[PDB]
Amino acid sequence: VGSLNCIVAVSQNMGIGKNGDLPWPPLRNEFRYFKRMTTTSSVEGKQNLVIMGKKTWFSIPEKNRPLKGRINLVLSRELKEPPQGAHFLSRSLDDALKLTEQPELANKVDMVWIVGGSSVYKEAMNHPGHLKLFVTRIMQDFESDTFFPEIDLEKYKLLPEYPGVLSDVQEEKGIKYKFEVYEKND
Numbered sequence: 697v698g699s700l701n702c703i704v705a706v707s708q709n710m711g712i713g714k715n716g717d718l719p720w721p722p723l724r725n726e727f728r729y730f731k732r733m734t735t736t737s738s739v740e741g742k743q744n745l746v747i748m749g750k751k752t753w754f755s756i757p758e759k760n761r762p763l764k765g766r767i768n769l770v771l772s773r774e775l776k777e778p779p780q781g782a783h784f785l786s787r788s789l790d791d792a793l794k795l796t797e798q799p800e801l802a803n804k805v806d807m808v809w810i811v812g813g814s815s816v817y818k819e820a821m822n823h824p825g826h827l828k829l830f831v832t833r834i835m836q837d838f839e840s841d842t843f844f845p846e847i848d849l850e851k852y853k854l855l856p857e858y859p860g861v862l863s864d865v866q867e868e869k870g871i872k873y874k875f876e877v878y879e880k881n882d
């Protein structure tokens with residue numbers, strides 16, 4: 697199993713969602729970036745694994761579920777089996793990461809991408825180890841009801857650039873945004 701990563705798009709006020717939807721109007725190229733980053737695997741014969749909470753899973757339009765070309769794992773203690781369309785279910789993040797080491801997945805998974813929501817991001821971000829955060833900064837305030845956890849910049853270094861990630865300002869639907877990559881190792 698390869699690297700562990702979080703990927704998120706976040707407003708200036710740290711918003712990531714409002715009532716199970718994104719706080720801002722759809723940004724087509726931003727979604728294309730998410731798709732490209734989470735799907736693209738460095739290793740031949742492997743796929744990336746996406747880990748998400750239950751509410752995040754059900755926030756994805758049914759047409760886009762499961763995220764194609766990726767192994768889809770849902771976190772829940774209430775569910776008794778993976779949701780329709782999903783591949784795996786784990787009770788905890790630690791359990792999910794342990795599963796990747798089991799003979800059923802260790803040979804199949806390259807990168808692991810945590811794609812939400814708030815509590816899953818928080819635990820990953822505060823757990824010792826090598827972790828990258830791929831953060832799209834939506835450069836406006838948007839009314840939100842769930843939020844990205846604090847990024848401790850003493851720990852998370854903003855990288856000056858990263859291959860495959862544009863460094864300049866993007867704009868769709870009159871909304872400016874930019875792509876960032878953070879890395880810790882503790």
Ligand SMILES: NC(=O)C1=CN([C@@H]2O[C@H](COP(=O)(O)OP(=O)(O)OC[C@H]3O[C@@H](n4cnc5c(N)ncnc54)[C@@H](OP(=O)(O)O)[C@@H]3O)[C@@H](O)[C@H]2O)C=CC1
Nearest residue numbers: 704705713716749750751752771772773774787812813814
């Ligand atoms: N802008 C962006 O980049 C992103 C935005 N979002 C949006 O943000 C909203 C935020 O979602 P949020 O409310 O945080 O919900 P989550 O997706 O984290 O789902 C919360 C639920 O997930 C299960 N869960 C979460 N963590 C764990 C864990 N460690 N172990 C076991 N089960 C877990 C649930 O199940 P249970 O009660 O069944 O045990 C818990 O009630 C989403 O609705 C989505 O629309 C989501 C991702 C990215």
Ligand SMILES: COc1ccc(OCCCCC(=O)O)cc1Cc1cnc(N)nc1N
Nearest residue numbers: 703704705727730731752756764811812832
């Ligand atoms: C839960 O995170 C997401 C999951 C899906 C999603 O839709 C993207 C459609 C792309 C098509 C595909 O991947 O096949 C959007 C999100 C939210 C999200 C958006 N942007 C970034 N940078 N990170 C996210 N987690």
